[PDB]
Amino acid sequence: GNRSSHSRLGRIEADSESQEDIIRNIARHLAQVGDSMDRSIPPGLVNGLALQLRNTSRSEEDRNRDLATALEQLLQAYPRDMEKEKTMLVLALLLAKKVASHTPSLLRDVFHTTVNFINQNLRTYVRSLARNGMD
Q: Where is the site Cleavage?
């Protein structure tokens, strides 16, 4: 082992700022040592054969996982509007609610103010969510 090489610098009073930055730096280091983990534990060239083996025998697979992927991908991305579902139930209740009784006054005005009081602070999260995309 004549490579020696000096890399045992380690951490030094300087990366204290931004603890998150420390992790990023540490990750990069591990990546370097992590890369050699793909050519130090196995006999060697084992991957080449594995990758090449699939290419040569590339006459199966995918055929059975074809539709399966669609179900997974489709299922994975199935947020749906949900508005039509919630709205339909809520809308129905409102119709029945009006029939059963008519939102009495006084309580509405008082309730509205009460909501404004609670709305504080919460509006920050709710407001951010509204008039905005996913992020």
A: 15-16, 39-40
